[PDB]
């Protein structure tokens, strides 16, 4: 042996997706479903805060985001942001001791930007986030650094004589498959074309390359894996491009891809100058966002637990 | 109980046989034989001698060159760490020139090795072709192999050489890697709108299933009449025996008609040659003639409709 | 069937009584099954 | 107008081409299928006195000649074969009915015991020496290191009784292998062939089982008109007898089961 | 409602051993079949747990 | 009607069941008890596939109803029915048709069995057939069972079953990485090679260049030994081919048996056991 | 419900080794079978965490 | 079945007592299982 090998027992949990007989179905491990559920547990809310009081911007010195919050509510919001992003470190993580109003430590200029990142998320991307919305926790999980944040990767080494395959390697990025190992930068950072399928049967009006097909395939494998599902979750594989035969999750995923293009482009890249080398990859690019970061292998972060509705301070205006 | 003719239960030896004599021009034969008691457990235990002419040597030569470019490239891709090479081997591969290059001969570091391995591989394959025709002539026999090999070469050429050139892009040929070439297959189907609705690929699939059906049937038959020396198909073909009779009759009583000891080999031959011949046709038309087979099938009303029980609104249209 | 006319009297006897024995165990289990949990 | 979509594209017409070549192919293979066994046997032919030779669709292909090597002959197909009586009688006079073999089923040479008349000459090596010959005729041959030598094992029929013992081993001079077992029969010390296909070994016991026939039946094994070689005719005659025991050697292989 | 019984004679026409395994096999199959039918239906006894569903003895 | 050498073999008996009851021929087909049963299973099956084509998924007047040969399709019930019999017009029909198909194939096999018993030939064919029957059963009985519902079976329709294969395969992201799949594919391919080589050989020797006589066993072996240094030999190639084809069916049956019931994750991920060994 | 004391003759009709091994195979099969049958229902006895969760809270 | 009439009384005896022993182990385990966790 030639060991044998990697295997689950019967019966798997199953779900019918499409019409009977069409083959659109999903299988899953009950064990791992219960463990995943236990690991994707949400932090209970802090009691709502009364008030009825002056606005935060009236009692504090450097409040550029969480303005219209009552003092009480602001305080509540601070306690949540503390346990949510850096509970082992507490208040002092993002503040200059003795001086709550100072921005003299980077983790705060960043915290500020992330208050605008979450607010933007919950109020502008519902076609994506619905009524669950997002919170600090979604990515942080009691951690200062989202465990599942990413960076553009260079692949393994190549002598100077030859250039990288761009694909062809053992990569848990692309589900272990051999497609290209960084299908994120061109799709979840930049906004390259995913579409390769022609809309006409005969040819002469679709320049899509086979290579483009493999890149779309790699990216798709990533996506599938990050939300922890299969193509029948969003598609009808007889026609990947056919939108009417897809599931409303394809629609949601469409809007999500754009959302990650906005998080990575106008909220994370700009923070690259005030962040330390420890938070940067070999090309100087910074740890950014992907679908995994938030979903962490589940179709809805924390199995669609609704955390944000309890904190009004995470919504715009 | 009764022997099944699966395992030679008791074998016998005689001095190895260097074989029927070739006329002048067909060079000596090389190597001197050996017997593997285990091959012998299931088949002729004789290993070789082999023939190697100009053709054969020039083919072994080209072929090993091609295998070296592919391999060396794979070791290079994991940095000459042979451990890593061993670890990702299944995932290692030599990708093709990028499209930016079209059909031009590209730099070493960008695909030129693929074009050289592709070049040398094809030449070595077609030389092995000629080899099998020569080897088939020295014996006065016919070119049935060579017409099949020519069919399989046809598909190969269609995959990595004919379609790429027609499509004006070496990047469309298949890359050398186990898992990589698996991905090329899948990506290939995806890019051209689900290859399942491509009729030629359905026929080729009918012919592959059929090569399995025919060899399974015929093989089962011949073993079932192996008690009558039915395996000795040559003399059952010239002097029909109760083996060829019981054989043809088993099928006659089961499905109503039958063939003969000689003709079943024609059904088999044609069915194998057919896989590769529908297959190549199938690839020939992908991108050159049809770009989206699912669509093609809809245009010819072959694609089924199911109650639309699940659907998604198209964001490109909002 | 290489039986005598009497070894079809004998066999028939053991066969019938045995089959009836089976039917007996059957009425036991179906009886218990109905008592604990009627199905009709 | 630079858009008049044509409804016929290269894939249609190429699938059409395929189907036409296909039909011609099928037909042709079905013609090669009638190079033997044809024209068929009906009571349509006999009722009509013969003006209805049965051949179906397609028709029969012109004879083809096989030129056997070594002064062997010339064979043709399709050929005209002389009818041959049936060693049996209709289980029913109604058509499609089977026939019951006449006499002692294994002797009948009917049913699993039937066989045609192949040449009364021998298959030959490339050189032209009798292909199938015994190891006694084929001096060179030899058992494979680590294989019980069949020579000296006991041949035993289907009901566990000894039949005889292996007196020699016949081999292929063309494709080195055991083709036949020789059996010095116990009951009359006469020599018979036993096809390998009918023989099972019991190596730890040095036995050679035969579910095919009973020990006694070994007495009637068809014989060789020469003990140092065998003819095509004789190979069929030998195997078919054993085959008969598969349906005849017991008053039960006849079936049913229920 | 005619006179001759003596239905023992039945074993003079049908082989007893084969009848035996035929019945034995049939009973085992019919058994698995019926078992599968009731367990896949309402009269099911496994997907219940007495006195309490046991994987709801642990919310945790 | 009979072959010109057939009457001499048309012996009586050999059944498994029936004896003289159905022990007769019809044209060239042998009937026998399992042929009568088979014909019943088959006829009712087909005739029902005909009623399904007649009614369509939404009724005989609906646009989805159809008699177009490419699109007619009878699909299983939803999963909500589990292993219960589902209403006729809700995948029930498919279940019955399945019972008929399985029964017809098993009958067919048993009839080839009675036919081997008659002719006194080996039972290699119906045994080999039984591998396809096995494959069919995992695809309609075993797998959907291990999966708590008959709805996991593939539909009976020319292209709809192709769609089934397609989406079930893609539920695992990249099926090509299924290792049993890789095996099975290799056997189907190798089978296709041996078949093409055997075919070629026999036809290359029994019909040589004009001017040459029927070739010999010596030629046969000398040729493949000339080209590739080995010849497995006549008998054995019939043995190998049977190995390749039956194995191809086998590994297909196991490759699909493990897709669900024994593996739920994507398939390329399986290969993780290889990138994670403590060697690297 | 009483023993026909000529039920020894059953072993004059049915081969002892075959009936025996048949029983062993049938039984071992049913056994492995049932074990999974129960493990597939609510009554699971493995995946319960008794008396304390064995892994951790997570990786820690 | 290659047994004597003298050796099937003996065999049946051994078969019965052994089988019943098995059934005993079974009834025991079903009893312990019912106690630790009744299933009906
Ligand atoms: C709510 C439903 C009830 C239930 C209702 C019933 C009912 C009702 C019946 C059964 C029956 C049986 N059930 Mg239940 N059963 C339930 C749950 C189970 C479970 C489980 C894991 O939960 C199991 C393993 C079983 C298993 C069994 C088998 C012991 C038996 C049928 C076997 C058979 O086909 O005979 C195969 C054929 C044979 C010949 C073997 C017979 C073996 C038995 C033990 C007797 C041995 C005699 C031996 C054969 C004598 C041989 C002679 C010697 C050679 C001389 N049940 C549920 C709880 N079960 C049947 C039964 O036992 O009949 C009384 C029956 O009528
Ligand atoms: C293996 C996974 C899928 C599958 C994969 C594929 C793929 C992939 C393809 C097919 C294709 C086809 N499959 Mg399929 N197929 C499967 C299981 C089956 C079963 C079954 C009951 O088990 C059947 C009957 C069929 C039958 C068929 C035919 C509709 C067609 C060509 C068969 C062929 O040439 O093969 C070789 C066998 C022969 C040549 C023997 C000739 C017998 C003919 C061809 C079969 C007649 C089918 C008949 C038209 C309808 C069934 C009978 C009706 C009940 C009357 N498939 C499984 C479920 N099948 C091919 C196609 O073109 O369909 C679009 C194709 O591309
Ligand atoms: C993955 C997504 C698509 C898919 C996409 C494709 C694509 C794309 C292709 C196929 C191809 C094939 N597919 Mg498909 N296929 C799918 C699903 C299926 C299913 C199924 C049950 O669903 C089946 C049965 C098949 C079956 C088949 C085969 C019938 C067919 C060609 C077989 C072959 O051997 O050619 C292989 C034989 C050869 C290439 C010739 C080999 C000869 C060479 C010269 C040997 C050289 C040896 C070398 C020199 C030795 C040295 C080694 C060096 C290392 C290289 N596909 C799915 C739907 N399929 C072909 C096709 O149909 O195209 C229309 C093809 O290219
Ligand atoms: C779609 C995405 C995945 C895919 C998903 C699947 C799935 C899912 C499956 C396969 C299956 C298989 N795939 Mg695939 N497969 C892919 C790509 C490929 C490629 C390729 C070139 O890339 C190939 C070669 C294959 C090939 C294979 C075969 C190994 C295998 C089917 C064998 C089989 O059915 O035997 C079995 C044969 C039978 C069941 C027929 C039994 C015959 C019965 C008894 C008789 C029928 C009689 C009938 C009535 C005849 C009608 C005649 C009329 C009456 C006259 N796949 C793509 C990548 N593939 C199937 C498999 O794994 O094996 C089952 C399967 O379920
Ligand atoms: C109906 C078409 C089917 C088919 C048919 C087919 N294949 C064929 C043929 C035919 C008719 C041949 O005539 C030919 C053959 O040779 O058959 C045995 C062949 C062939 N099919 C093969 C492969 C093949 N065919 C395939 C497919 C198919 N072939 C279809 C199923 C497949 C697939 C897709 O699975 C494969 C992988 C090869 C065995 C053979 C072609 C071999 C060839 O072209 O050789 C090129 C050169 C080399 C491989 C270099 C030789 C490498 C040596 C092993 C090294 C030895 C070293 C030595 C010790 C010397 C020392 C070195 C010195 C430099 C120091
Ligand atoms: C296992 C190795 C290969 C194999 C072996 C094999 N198949 C065999 C045999 C053997 C040895 C036979 O002896 C037997 C035969 O008779 O030879 C032609 C057979 C057989 N191979 C056949 C088919 C077949 N084998 C296949 C494959 C395989 N069989 C493997 C490749 C395939 C595929 C899918 O590739 C097919 C289609 C049949 C022609 C024949 C068995 C036919 C038979 O048994 O007839 C009785 C049944 C009917 C006449 C029809 C019954 C009617 C049903 C009620 C309706 C059918 C419903 C069906 C389920 C719907 C499917 C719809 C499709 C559109 C999808
Ligand atoms: C309502 C009611 C009363 C009904 C009326 C009855 C009706 C409708 C009658 C119509 C009559 C007709 C036309 C139809 C009958 C249809 C039947 C029952 C079904 C057909 C069943 C059947 C299995 C058909 C399948 C056909 C196909 C193509 C099978 C694939 C196999 C294949 C490629 C076939 C051809 C090649 C064959 C036969 C090879 C067998 C073969 C092999 C394999 C050898 O190795 C061998 C070696 C040495 C000598 C001979 C042989 C040999 O003959
Ligand atoms: C006229 O006769 C002919 C000859 O005779 C002269 C020839 O010599 C020749 C020349 C023939 C050859 C050179 C043969 C060539 C064969 C080739 C190229 C095939 C390639 C095969 C390999 C490389 C070996 C692959 C196989 C293995 C390594 C074994 C692996 C074992 C595995 C996976 C586990 C086994 C278990 C299973 C598969 C599970 C269950 C399987 C079954 C139940 C199958 C049952 C099988 C039988 C046989 C009853 C021909 C063509 C011919 O036609
Ligand atoms: C460390 O390693 C050492 C021993 C050096 C060597 C090791 C070598 C190894 C292990 C190599 C491993 C190789 C493997 C596993 C290769 C696998 C390859 C696979 C699976 C390929 C699959 C498909 C490939 C195809 C179909 C390729 C098609 C390519 C074609 C048809 C190319 C045609 C090109 C031509 C004819 C070139 C024309 C050149 C012209 C003349 C046009 O230029 C002007
Ligand atoms: C319980 C612990 C904490 C307390 C008591 C607390 C308290 C406060 C107070 C009183 C202010 C207003 C100070 C001012 O603007 O003058 C403030 C602002 C702010 N704090 Fe916190 N804080 C806590 C934890 C955190 C954590 C963990 C983060 C980041 C993860 C954070 C990020 C911020 C940011 C960015 C501002 C500026 C707010 C804006 O522009 O809206 N605080 N905090
Ligand atoms: C590994 C299997 C998968 C494959 C092979 C795959 C393949 C593809 C392909 C080829 C396209 C392009 C279709 C076209 O060109 O019009 C596509 C588009 C798309 N897929 Fe996927 N997919 C997979 C899984 C998923 C999953 C799980 C989701 C959702 C979470 C998803 C969501 C989407 C969306 C929204 C689009 C449209 C993207 C756009 O138009 O920019 N796919 N997929
Ligand atoms: Ba899954
Ligand atoms: Ba219940
Ligand atoms: Ba429990
Ligand atoms: Ba490690
Ligand atoms: Ba633990
Ligand atoms: Fe053959």
JSON list of C-alpha atoms and ligand atoms in Angstrom, two decimals, chain A residues 193-199 213 216-217 220-221 223-225 227 229-235 240-243 249-255 257-258 261, chain B residues 190 316, chain F residues 170 173-174, ligand 11:
[
{"chain": "A", "resi": 193, "resn": "UNK", "atom": "CA", "xyz": [-13.45, 38.38, -17.99]},
{"chain": "A", "resi": 194, "resn": "UNK", "atom": "CA", "xyz": [-14.92, 35.17, -16.55]},
{"chain": "A", "resi": 195, "resn": "UNK", "atom": "CA", "xyz": [-17.16, 34.50, -19.53]},
{"chain": "A", "resi": 196, "resn": "UNK", "atom": "CA", "xyz": [-15.90, 32.12, -22.29]},
{"chain": "A", "resi": 197, "resn": "UNK", "atom": "CA", "xyz": [-19.10, 30.42, -23.43]},
{"chain": "A", "resi": 198, "resn": "UNK", "atom": "CA", "xyz": [-20.46, 31.48, -26.76]},
{"chain": "A", "resi": 199, "resn": "UNK", "atom": "CA", "xyz": [-24.05, 32.60, -27.09]},
{"chain": "A", "resi": 213, "resn": "UNK", "atom": "CA", "xyz": [-11.85, 28.60, -20.04]},
{"chain": "A", "resi": 216, "resn": "UNK", "atom": "CA", "xyz": [-12.68, 30.50, -15.36]},
{"chain": "A", "resi": 217, "resn": "UNK", "atom": "CA", "xyz": [-12.66, 26.90, -14.26]},
{"chain": "A", "resi": 220, "resn": "UNK", "atom": "CA", "xyz": [-14.94, 28.59, -10.13]},
{"chain": "A", "resi": 221, "resn": "UNK", "atom": "CA", "xyz": [-13.32, 25.82, -8.21]},
{"chain": "A", "resi": 223, "resn": "UNK", "atom": "CA", "xyz": [-15.58, 29.83, -5.37]},
{"chain": "A", "resi": 224, "resn": "UNK", "atom": "CA", "xyz": [-17.18, 26.44, -4.98]},
{"chain": "A", "resi": 225, "resn": "UNK", "atom": "CA", "xyz": [-14.76, 25.45, -2.33]},
{"chain": "A", "resi": 227, "resn": "UNK", "atom": "CA", "xyz": [-18.71, 28.53, 0.01]},
{"chain": "A", "resi": 229, "resn": "UNK", "atom": "CA", "xyz": [-20.75, 23.65, -2.35]},
{"chain": "A", "resi": 230, "resn": "UNK", "atom": "CA", "xyz": [-20.86, 22.22, -5.88]},
{"chain": "A", "resi": 231, "resn": "UNK", "atom": "CA", "xyz": [-21.90, 23.64, -9.25]},
{"chain": "A", "resi": 232, "resn": "UNK", "atom": "CA", "xyz": [-25.31, 22.35, -8.92]},
{"chain": "A", "resi": 233, "resn": "UNK", "atom": "CA", "xyz": [-25.67, 24.97, -6.20]},
{"chain": "A", "resi": 234, "resn": "UNK", "atom": "CA", "xyz": [-25.77, 27.68, -8.78]},
{"chain": "A", "resi": 235, "resn": "UNK", "atom": "CA", "xyz": [-25.75, 26.00, -12.18]},
{"chain": "A", "resi": 240, "resn": "UNK", "atom": "CA", "xyz": [-23.23, 26.89, -17.31]},
{"chain": "A", "resi": 241, "resn": "UNK", "atom": "CA", "xyz": [-23.88, 30.07, -19.19]},
{"chain": "A", "resi": 242, "resn": "UNK", "atom": "CA", "xyz": [-27.66, 29.63, -19.28]},
{"chain": "A", "resi": 243, "resn": "UNK", "atom": "CA", "xyz": [-28.99, 31.93, -16.66]},
{"chain": "A", "resi": 249, "resn": "UNK", "atom": "CA", "xyz": [-27.54, 31.60, -5.97]},
{"chain": "A", "resi": 250, "resn": "UNK", "atom": "CA", "xyz": [-25.85, 32.30, -9.33]},
{"chain": "A", "resi": 251, "resn": "UNK", "atom": "CA", "xyz": [-27.42, 35.74, -9.20]},
{"chain": "A", "resi": 252, "resn": "UNK", "atom": "CA", "xyz": [-26.20, 36.22, -5.62]},
{"chain": "A", "resi": 253, "resn": "UNK", "atom": "CA", "xyz": [-22.72, 35.08, -6.56]},
{"chain": "A", "resi": 254, "resn": "UNK", "atom": "CA", "xyz": [-22.68, 37.45, -9.43]},
{"chain": "A", "resi": 255, "resn": "UNK", "atom": "CA", "xyz": [-23.21, 40.41, -7.09]},
{"chain": "A", "resi": 257, "resn": "UNK", "atom": "CA", "xyz": [-17.90, 38.92, -7.05]},
{"chain": "A", "resi": 258, "resn": "UNK", "atom": "CA", "xyz": [-18.37, 42.64, -7.53]},
{"chain": "A", "resi": 261, "resn": "UNK", "atom": "CA", "xyz": [-13.85, 43.64, -6.07]},
{"chain": "B", "resi": 190, "resn": "UNK", "atom": "CA", "xyz": [-16.80, 23.76, -21.04]},
{"chain": "B", "resi": 316, "resn": "UNK", "atom": "CA", "xyz": [-25.97, 41.28, -16.95]},
{"chain": "F", "resi": 170, "resn": "UNK", "atom": "CA", "xyz": [-20.08, 18.06, -11.76]},
{"chain": "F", "resi": 173, "resn": "UNK", "atom": "CA", "xyz": [-16.26, 19.74, -9.26]},
{"chain": "F", "resi": 174, "resn": "UNK", "atom": "CA", "xyz": [-13.70, 17.89, -11.36]},
{"chain": "I", "resi": 11, "resn": "LIG", "atom": "C1", "xyz": [-16.08, 23.50, -10.54]},
{"chain": "I", "resi": 11, "resn": "LIG", "atom": "C2", "xyz": [-17.25, 23.67, -11.15]},
{"chain": "I", "resi": 11, "resn": "LIG", "atom": "C3", "xyz": [-17.75, 24.97, -11.63]},
{"chain": "I", "resi": 11, "resn": "LIG", "atom": "C4", "xyz": [-17.49, 25.24, -12.92]},
{"chain": "I", "resi": 11, "resn": "LIG", "atom": "C5", "xyz": [-16.76, 24.33, -13.87]},
{"chain": "I", "resi": 11, "resn": "LIG", "atom": "C6", "xyz": [-18.00, 26.51, -13.22]},
{"chain": "I", "resi": 11, "resn": "LIG", "atom": "C7", "xyz": [-17.85, 27.05, -14.49]},
{"chain": "I", "resi": 11, "resn": "LIG", "atom": "C8", "xyz": [-18.33, 28.28, -14.86]},
{"chain": "I", "resi": 11, "resn": "LIG", "atom": "C9", "xyz": [-18.19, 28.81, -16.15]},
{"chain": "I", "resi": 11, "resn": "LIG", "atom": "C10", "xyz": [-17.51, 28.17, -17.33]},
{"chain": "I", "resi": 11, "resn": "LIG", "atom": "C11", "xyz": [-18.76, 30.01, -16.18]},
{"chain": "I", "resi": 11, "resn": "LIG", "atom": "C12", "xyz": [-18.77, 30.87, -17.42]},
{"chain": "I", "resi": 11, "resn": "LIG", "atom": "C13", "xyz": [-20.08, 30.68, -18.20]},
{"chain": "I", "resi": 11, "resn": "LIG", "atom": "C14", "xyz": [-20.06, 31.67, -19.34]},
{"chain": "I", "resi": 11, "resn": "LIG", "atom": "O1", "xyz": [-19.04, 31.81, -19.96]},
{"chain": "I", "resi": 11, "resn": "LIG", "atom": "O2", "xyz": [-21.16, 32.40, -19.64]},
{"chain": "I", "resi": 11, "resn": "LIG", "atom": "C15", "xyz": [-19.27, 30.25, -14.89]},
{"chain": "I", "resi": 11, "resn": "LIG", "atom": "C16", "xyz": [-19.94, 31.42, -14.54]},
{"chain": "I", "resi": 11, "resn": "LIG", "atom": "C17", "xyz": [-20.45, 31.67, -13.27]},
{"chain": "I", "resi": 11, "resn": "LIG", "atom": "N1", "xyz": [-20.45, 30.84, -12.23]},
{"chain": "I", "resi": 11, "resn": "LIG", "atom": "FE1", "xyz": [-19.51, 29.22, -12.19]},
{"chain": "I", "resi": 11, "resn": "LIG", "atom": "N2", "xyz": [-18.64, 27.01, -12.16]},
{"chain": "I", "resi": 11, "resn": "LIG", "atom": "C18", "xyz": [-18.50, 26.20, -11.09]},
{"chain": "I", "resi": 11, "resn": "LIG", "atom": "C19", "xyz": [-19.04, 26.49, -9.81]},
{"chain": "I", "resi": 11, "resn": "LIG", "atom": "C20", "xyz": [-19.74, 27.68, -9.46]},
{"chain": "I", "resi": 11, "resn": "LIG", "atom": "C21", "xyz": [-20.31, 28.03, -8.17]},
{"chain": "I", "resi": 11, "resn": "LIG", "atom": "C22", "xyz": [-20.31, 27.22, -6.88]},
{"chain": "I", "resi": 11, "resn": "LIG", "atom": "C23", "xyz": [-20.89, 29.30, -8.26]},
{"chain": "I", "resi": 11, "resn": "LIG", "atom": "C24", "xyz": [-21.56, 30.13, -7.27]},
{"chain": "I", "resi": 11, "resn": "LIG", "atom": "C25", "xyz": [-21.15, 30.18, -6.02]},
{"chain": "I", "resi": 11, "resn": "LIG", "atom": "C26", "xyz": [-20.70, 29.74, -9.56]},
{"chain": "I", "resi": 11, "resn": "LIG", "atom": "C27", "xyz": [-21.17, 30.99, -9.91]},
{"chain": "I", "resi": 11, "resn": "LIG", "atom": "C28", "xyz": [-21.01, 31.49, -11.19]},
{"chain": "I", "resi": 11, "resn": "LIG", "atom": "C29", "xyz": [-21.50, 32.80, -11.64]},
{"chain": "I", "resi": 11, "resn": "LIG", "atom": "C30", "xyz": [-22.24, 33.84, -10.84]},
{"chain": "I", "resi": 11, "resn": "LIG", "atom": "C31", "xyz": [-21.16, 32.91, -12.93]},
{"chain": "I", "resi": 11, "resn": "LIG", "atom": "C32", "xyz": [-21.42, 34.08, -13.83]},
{"chain": "I", "resi": 11, "resn": "LIG", "atom": "C33", "xyz": [-20.13, 34.92, -13.74]},
{"chain": "I", "resi": 11, "resn": "LIG", "atom": "C34", "xyz": [-20.11, 36.11, -14.67]},
{"chain": "I", "resi": 11, "resn": "LIG", "atom": "O3", "xyz": [-20.97, 36.22, -15.52]},
{"chain": "I", "resi": 11, "resn": "LIG", "atom": "O4", "xyz": [-19.13, 37.02, -14.54]},
{"chain": "I", "resi": 11, "resn": "LIG", "atom": "N3", "xyz": [-20.01, 28.75, -10.26]},
{"chain": "I", "resi": 11, "resn": "LIG", "atom": "N4", "xyz": [-19.00, 29.16, -14.09]}
]
